[PDB]
Amino acid sequence: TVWQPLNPGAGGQVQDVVADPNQANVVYMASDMEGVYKSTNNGESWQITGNLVNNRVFAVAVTPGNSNKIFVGTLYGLHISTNGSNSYALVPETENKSIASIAFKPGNANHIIAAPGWRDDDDFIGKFGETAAGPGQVFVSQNGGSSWQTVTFDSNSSTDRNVYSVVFDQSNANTVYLGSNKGVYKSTNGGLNWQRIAGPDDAVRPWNKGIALSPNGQVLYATYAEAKPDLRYNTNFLVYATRTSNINWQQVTGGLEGNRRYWYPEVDPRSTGNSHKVLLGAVKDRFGLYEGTFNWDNNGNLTNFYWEKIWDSYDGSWDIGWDYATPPNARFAHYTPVTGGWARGVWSTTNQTMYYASHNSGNNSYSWQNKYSTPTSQTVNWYGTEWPTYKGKGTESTYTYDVAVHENYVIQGQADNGLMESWDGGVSWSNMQHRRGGGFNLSDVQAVDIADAWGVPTVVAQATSGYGGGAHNGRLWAKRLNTHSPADQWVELAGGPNAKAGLPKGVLRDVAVSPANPAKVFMFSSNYGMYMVEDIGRALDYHDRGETLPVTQIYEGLDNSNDARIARKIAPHPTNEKVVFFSSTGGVQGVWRGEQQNDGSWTFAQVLASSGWDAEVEAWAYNGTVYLMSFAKGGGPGLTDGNNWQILLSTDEGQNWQKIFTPADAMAVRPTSNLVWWNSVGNRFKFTGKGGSAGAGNKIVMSYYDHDYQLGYGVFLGTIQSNGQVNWQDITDDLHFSGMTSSRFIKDAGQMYLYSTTPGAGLWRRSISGMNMDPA
Amino acid sequence: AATVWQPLNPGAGGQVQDVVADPNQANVVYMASDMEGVYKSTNNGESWQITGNLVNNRVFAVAVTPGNSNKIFVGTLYGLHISTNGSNSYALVPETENKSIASIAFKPGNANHIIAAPGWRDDDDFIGKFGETAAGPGQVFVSQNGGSSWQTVTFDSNSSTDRNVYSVVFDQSNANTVYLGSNKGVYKSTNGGLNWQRIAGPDDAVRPWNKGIALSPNGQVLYATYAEAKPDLRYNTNFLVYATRTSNINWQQVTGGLEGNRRYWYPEVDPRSTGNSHKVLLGAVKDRFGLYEGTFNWDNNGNLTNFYWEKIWDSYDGSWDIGWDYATPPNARFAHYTPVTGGWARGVWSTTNQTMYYASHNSGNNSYSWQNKYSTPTSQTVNWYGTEWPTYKGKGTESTYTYDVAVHENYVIQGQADNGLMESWDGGVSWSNMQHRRGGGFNLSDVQAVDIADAWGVPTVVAQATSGYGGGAHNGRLWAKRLNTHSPADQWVELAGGPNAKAGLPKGVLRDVAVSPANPAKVFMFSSNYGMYMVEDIGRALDYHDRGETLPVTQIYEGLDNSNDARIARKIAPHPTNEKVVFFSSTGGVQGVWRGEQQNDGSWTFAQVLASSGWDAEVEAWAYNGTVYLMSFAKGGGPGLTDGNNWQILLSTDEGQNWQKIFTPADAMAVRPTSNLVWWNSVGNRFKFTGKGGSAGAGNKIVMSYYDHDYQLGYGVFLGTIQSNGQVNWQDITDDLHFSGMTSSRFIKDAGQMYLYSTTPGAGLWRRSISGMNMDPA
Numbered sequence A: 001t002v003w004q005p006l007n008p009g010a011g012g013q014v015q016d017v018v019a020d021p022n023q024a025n026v027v028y029m030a031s032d033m034e035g036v037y038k039s040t041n042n043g044e045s046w047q048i049t050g051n052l053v054n055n056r057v058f059a060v061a062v063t064p065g066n067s068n069k070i071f072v073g074t075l076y077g078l079h080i081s082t083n084g085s086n087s088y089a090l091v092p093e094t095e096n097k098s099i100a101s102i103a104f105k106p107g108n109a110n111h112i113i114a115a116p117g118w119r120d121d122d123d124f125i126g127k128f129g130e131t132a133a134g135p136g137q138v139f140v141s142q143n144g145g146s147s148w149q150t151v152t153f154d155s156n157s158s159t160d161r162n163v164y165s166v167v168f169d170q171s172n173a174n175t176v177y178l179g180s181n182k183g184v185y186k187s188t189n190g191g192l193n194w195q196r197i198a199g200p201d202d203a204v205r206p207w208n209k210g211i212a213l214s215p216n217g218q219v220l221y222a223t224y225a226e227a228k229p230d231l232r233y234n235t236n237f238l239v240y241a242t243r244t245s246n247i248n249w250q251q252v253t254g255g256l257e258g259n260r261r262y263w264y265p266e267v268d269p270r271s272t273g274n275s276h277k278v279l280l281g282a283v284k285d286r287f288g289l290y291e292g293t294f295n296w297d298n299n300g301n302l303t304n305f306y307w308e309k310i311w312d313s314y315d316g317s318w319d320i321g322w323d324y325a326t327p328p329n330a331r332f333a334h335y336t337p338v339t340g341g342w343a344r345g346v347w348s349t350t351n352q353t354m355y356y357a358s359h360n361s362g363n364n365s366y367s368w369q370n371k372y373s374t375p376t377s378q379t380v381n382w383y384g385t386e387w388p389t390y391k392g393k394g395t396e397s398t399y400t401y402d403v404a405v406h407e408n409y410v411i412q413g414q415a416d417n418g419l420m421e422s423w424d425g426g427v428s429w430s431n432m433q434h435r436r437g438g439g440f441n442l443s444d445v446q447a448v449d450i451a452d453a454w455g456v457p458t459v460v461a462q463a464t465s466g467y468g469g470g471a472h473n474g475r476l477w478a479k480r481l482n483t484h485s486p487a488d489q490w491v492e493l494a495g496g497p498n499a500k501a502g503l504p505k506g507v508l509r510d511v512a513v514s515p516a517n518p519a520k521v522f523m524f525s526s527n528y529g530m531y532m533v534e535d536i537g538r539a540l541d542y543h544d545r546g547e548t549l550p551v552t553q554i555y556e557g558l559d560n561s562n563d564a565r566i567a568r569k570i571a572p573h574p575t576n577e578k579v580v581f582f583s584s585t586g587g588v589q590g591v592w593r594g595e596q597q598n599d600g601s602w603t604f605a606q607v608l609a610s611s612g613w614d615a616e617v618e619a620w621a622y623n624g625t626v627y628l629m630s631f632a633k634g635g636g637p638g639l640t641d642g643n644n645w646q647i648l649l650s651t652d653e654g655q656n657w658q659k660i661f662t663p664a665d666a667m668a669v670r671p672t673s674n675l676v677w678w679n680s681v682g683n684r685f686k687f688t689g690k691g692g693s694a695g696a697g698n699k700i701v702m703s704y705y706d707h708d709y710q711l712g713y714g715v716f717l718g719t720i721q722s723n724g725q726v727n728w729q730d731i732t733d734d735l736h737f738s739g740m741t742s743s744r745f746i747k748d749a750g751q752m753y754l755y756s757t758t759p760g761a762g763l764w765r766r767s768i769s770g771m772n773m774d775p776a
Numbered sequence B: 001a002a003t004v005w006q007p008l009n010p011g012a013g014g015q016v017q018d019v020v021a022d023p024n025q026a027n028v029v030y031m032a033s034d035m036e037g038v039y040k041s042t043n044n045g046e047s048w049q050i051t052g053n054l055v056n057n058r059v060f061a062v063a064v065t066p067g068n069s070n071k072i073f074v075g076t077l078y079g080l081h082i083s084t085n086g087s088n089s090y091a092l093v094p095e096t097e098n099k100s101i102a103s104i105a106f107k108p109g110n111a112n113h114i115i116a117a118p119g120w121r122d123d124d125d126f127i128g129k130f131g132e133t134a135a136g137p138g139q140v141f142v143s144q145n146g147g148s149s150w151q152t153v154t155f156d157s158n159s160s161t162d163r164n165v166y167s168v169v170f171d172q173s174n175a176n177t178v179y180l181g182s183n184k185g186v187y188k189s190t191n192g193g194l195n196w197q198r199i200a201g202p203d204d205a206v207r208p209w210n211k212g213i214a215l216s217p218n219g220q221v222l223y224a225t226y227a228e229a230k231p232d233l234r235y236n237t238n239f240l241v242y243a244t245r246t247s248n249i250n251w252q253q254v255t256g257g258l259e260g261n262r263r264y265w266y267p268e269v270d271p272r273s274t275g276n277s278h279k280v281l282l283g284a285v286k287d288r289f290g291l292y293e294g295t296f297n298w299d300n301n302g303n304l305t306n307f308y309w310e311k312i313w314d315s316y317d318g319s320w321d322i323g324w325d326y327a328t329p330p331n332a333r334f335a336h337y338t339p340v341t342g343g344w345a346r347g348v349w350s351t352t353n354q355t356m357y358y359a360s361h362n363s364g365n366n367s368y369s370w371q372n373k374y375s376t377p378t379s380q381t382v383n384w385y386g387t388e389w390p391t392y393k394g395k396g397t398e399s400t401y402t403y404d405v406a407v408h409e410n411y412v413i414q415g416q417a418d419n420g421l422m423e424s425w426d427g428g429v430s431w432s433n434m435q436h437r438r439g440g441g442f443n444l445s446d447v448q449a450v451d452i453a454d455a456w457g458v459p460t461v462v463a464q465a466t467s468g469y470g471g472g473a474h475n476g477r478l479w480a481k482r483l484n485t486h487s488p489a490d491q492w493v494e495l496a497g498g499p500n501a502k503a504g505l506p507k508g509v510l511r512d513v514a515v516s517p518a519n520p521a522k523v524f525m526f527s528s529n530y531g532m533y534m535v536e537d538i539g540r541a542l543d544y545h546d547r548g549e550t551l552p553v554t555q556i557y558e559g560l561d562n563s564n565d566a567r568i569a570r571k572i573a574p575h576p577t578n579e580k581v582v583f584f585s586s587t588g589g590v591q592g593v594w595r596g597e598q599q600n601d602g603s604w605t606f607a608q609v610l611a612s613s614g615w616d617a618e619v620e621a622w623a624y625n626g627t628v629y630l631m632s633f634a635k636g637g638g639p640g641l642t643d644g645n646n647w648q649i650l651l652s653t654d655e656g657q658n659w660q661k662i663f664t665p666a667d668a669m670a671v672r673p674t675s676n677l678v679w680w681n682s683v684g685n686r687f688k689f690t691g692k693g694g695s696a697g698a699g700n701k702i703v704m705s706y707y708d709h710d711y712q713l714g715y716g717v718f719l720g721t722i723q724s725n726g727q728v729n730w731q732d733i734t735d736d737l738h739f740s741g742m743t744s745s746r747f748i749k750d751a752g753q754m755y756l757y758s759t760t761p762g763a764g765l766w767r768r769s770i771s772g773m774n775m776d777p778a
């Protein structure tokens, strides 16, 4: 172990949790950014599995009778493992074909169906050139996955082809149904020829959103929806049942909440008779989880049915973990298998989490268990209630923008989850303080830093509302670390919807404290300009009186042809508080330098004609030399190399630059033999990044990453030698998701570390050896 | 050039002997300390600078030659020194070698006629350090050549009697007239000092000893104080003040208006009183009453028309800056008018005892404005006793006996004698000790040990702190200050000890208190002549204290047993990674390095592991690169290790089972040749290679300091580096540290740089940057 994770567990949208039918307590989890995790203790702890070509996983299936053979459906196609998920290989027939369901023929594990699909991730189906519209197809293997046949069930190239489920008749293994936006289809020869099943009301709601079939094969359950381009605005899915011997649908929503996106129904494999247990959650909607009971008679008539919430709002009966997400959005839900020694239970989620319910057949009760985070003995106070801090169970799937550390305190600023805070060095966390009174949540935190309020170390943060990275505005908050404990509180200083302190509403893509005067804080409001808090102690003095001290505007950026309009990273000068650098990503791009004059006025100018949306600049001092380091595209004549991002270095504050790292350097230090995905999607890979470069003392770090495909090439550490040259080494090591949004060199407990945040796998740190620092 | 050793002190803090104005240059003054030699200032005390190296640093007198401000005489316990470069360097006068001198006086009109008088002020407990005795013949060294040679003039033949001379004063109106004031009595010469004979005092039956004389500038009136002939000043408290004309010996007591029963001494006439009205300045030794100025109006027939005494300095009332040393009323143990030459204005130089103070004079008012000339107030305040007191940074002198130091972030504490808890919140620049004054006459003036503990995650100062002056600590008390804010708002609370044995901790002084590095909530302490005790968790002890309750300490070792037990600890060294193991250096009962090991049942077994000895012997235990080091600074050690009374550095890497010599006096003399010591040729034959402590170990670094407290001689500070083959290579790091004897040293990282913090038995706290140090990450 080299890279050390510091996360509270999970935190990203979970696609599925799949049980191994051959052995109780063995489960796999499909993440949308880090691939597949495995557990052999029913989710008490999770371990990463082998490397996939694409990490956006929609389906995992374990071969009945062979736990070593596992199939994984990803956005780029099907993978097969023959060593129990230790290693994976892309299946050539399905390359560039997103797969989201995998089903085995009952009694013949060599007969497999893998169906094109992508769950609700319509936003991502085009990342590799696919479209939602196309012929309706499935892939069928009859030799256990060595070869696959392409079967067409609909030939309309202009209609949505997403398949949501494939389900076999347990009582007649050659009968199989599929549920698709194309409709529900049936095959009586194992999936080689299909016929369409008419829906309950195809003129109005033709799209199927999942089917279920009773084990005796006699009853089909389905939900149906109107045709609309985006699930965001398609809210009412209705639930129906029909006998399969004569298609005649009846609506069976009596007892369900109205106007919900019910999907992926599923019959308990234990329902072998005329009473069927049907598990029903939904995409997006938060209502917990339903179990329905349908009592048919032997005439094929439904005597009665009833839906029961077996999971509901937070009420004290289950540990919600750190992710206070109530009611649960049960975006997947499965009964446990009847094989392998499994007990009867339910696997589900609150959306970003993993939950397992055990079942009491005496009183038909469910007991929900947190399978993503572990509470510690530390407590935080919020809503007048005490909540534990939580340490991860082995997974981490958060989009983390930035990180700051002071003594025992760590904060990572995340998308979706906002202010993620730790008071034990990053072992356990809580983000409860981001849920503010008045009904708004500080769910997007793009920058954090540590300032100085009259000698008291004070966290500063760009913290605003908005999910999925859709930050609403620039908004500056501060937390005085009086106790380095959960008792410390956040207060708002500037920005927000109310334009507090005269700070405009443009997002502060970075907030930076001056190392020379840590009371002074710089921030760049997107499309407005660069602003400054001269002394944060004075700003808090006004705040404590119920007043507000205005911020100072030091640069105006409102002209696209002449001004820098957006900044990604601000680098104050390490020793001169009247000089700052920033990387401009809007208007006139590149590294900009500003200098304050005696009358307090500033002059700004471009010092490197670079570009790139996530371009960074860093300035530090080491043994008498001030280094200026740019990670970006371009640079001008003699430096630009197409759209390749490069590391450029200057020792004279940006008047002269030297190219010290390129993609060719990266490939020589870390050959493409190290990348499982090079042969298949290397022709698409672009040498860019999400950020994550840093410099301190004699060390420099960077990471090549292409967010278009969630592909990370590697992490590279450079050592500045006594003569000026930089020698580079590969420090990727065991970091499996290596793209980086930010990196900082941080000394903790007398040892120098590299703290790095990732756009999908949270926070990691790594020991750095042989480092020299200036005494500071 | 530049500086290496960096002082961190509030200013002065030790008994001040004198402040002498340069008559040739206004605002030029010299200060006589008893352990730092002579300080100089050219801005009338706004800032002080060190001067040249003396052979002995107990200075009793300083005099600048009239007409040549570059020739300066300095009287010390070992004799007169002479500088010809304005105090930059000194040479010891050979005729006065081993002769304590406390008075130097020049002849008016001819500065080549000088008188140097044997003396030692009130330092009767120090006159014997180099073999001298208080009893002896009354004698005086006189020179007619400006200092080339000195002849010994005897004015009393009795060797049964005390010969201390207090003052020597010429007659400004006829330069060959001069008097001296001595425990012999008042003697007068019309010779310029070649023959003398005794003047009868006012009542030699009861009070034969004169404690200083003063002569009016016209030579016509003499003032004096006379004392009983009792040696110990603690039981001789009633000095009486008299006046006589010099035409007829006819003493008149002139105490009316003075406080009764005071040790009045060193009277002085304002050189401006050239007529028949005299202003007389009068302070005292020990007694605290401020400072008197007396006015004597004589008429030409020769009688005292009238006289009155007025307090020109008094109890603190807010009208003068008392500085950090809340010492009120002032004990004006010296007081001098400013000269009339050199452009000086009229003023008074004096002290509250450990300080330096200057008063300016308003003539159209007869008011004095007292100015703090030892420390500088900052803008930080300490709230105490309904008043907000500034913190104070030093003006260039430091004279405190400091036992120990502890640092956490911006907070620094010096544990001192006399001045108790000396605390800083800006890294040691400025200080306050006001919190040691607890009220009701209960002052924590002696703090022999400090450390930083951990109370539920909050760093917490722990201290042995008790009443008593001059190092006479009354008992052991454990105090704790939680550093909630690292600011003067943090407060001390007493956890255990005292005369009522709070928490079951007995009354013996906790000569050391040490926190376990493996578990910083656990604190060890050794109560002198009782044993070793433990606070298992200081947070839990504070939980009880905050409820108005007390959690008992734990006894882990009885030290009641003279022939079997260790009974006094000088330093406790808890094991760096195993909280069940503790070492300490025993300096009472069975001496040496002892090791205690906690067993399964919770009991402890202790045993001696080195047969060392020494009152200030130290032990240090630390870890570096997989080795646990145990280092002793002491004499002895047993067969193969003992070498007479020489202190040595012994090292062990197996918890004291086997030891090796790694530094000896021979190694020190090779690394730092005696060529570096100005005192070697005079008193080097007396120097013993001992120490007051100040050894330390951390990472690949070991430090020690050779120092003989019997003569206040420091040989040097030595730093050893642990090579990868296990051997230690030593270097001299004395550099500009002029007082280099040490009571404690700690290696401390501050803002990314390793520093050595060392406290000294007389010059406060100093720190030095340490290069090439490597630590285990922790």
Ligand SMILES: [Cl-]
Pocket: A251, A252, A253, A254
């Ligand atoms: Cl219904």
Ligand SMILES: [Cl-]
Pocket: B709, B710, B712, B761
């Ligand atoms: Cl001493």
Ligand SMILES: [Zn+2]
Pocket: A013, A032, A120, A121
């Ligand atoms: Zn998704």
Ligand SMILES: [Zn+2]
Pocket: A402, A446, A447, A448, A510, A511, A742
């Ligand atoms: Zn940032």
Ligand SMILES: [Zn+2]
Pocket: B015, B034, B122, B123
């Ligand atoms: Zn004295």
Ligand SMILES: [Zn+2]
Pocket: B404, B448, B449, B450, B512, B513, B571, B744
């Ligand atoms: Zn100590």
Ligand SMILES: [Zn+2]
Pocket: B539, B540, B543, B544
């Ligand atoms: Zn308690």
Ligand SMILES: [Zn+2]
Pocket: B558, B559, B560, B561, B562, B564, B565
């Ligand atoms: Zn005993």
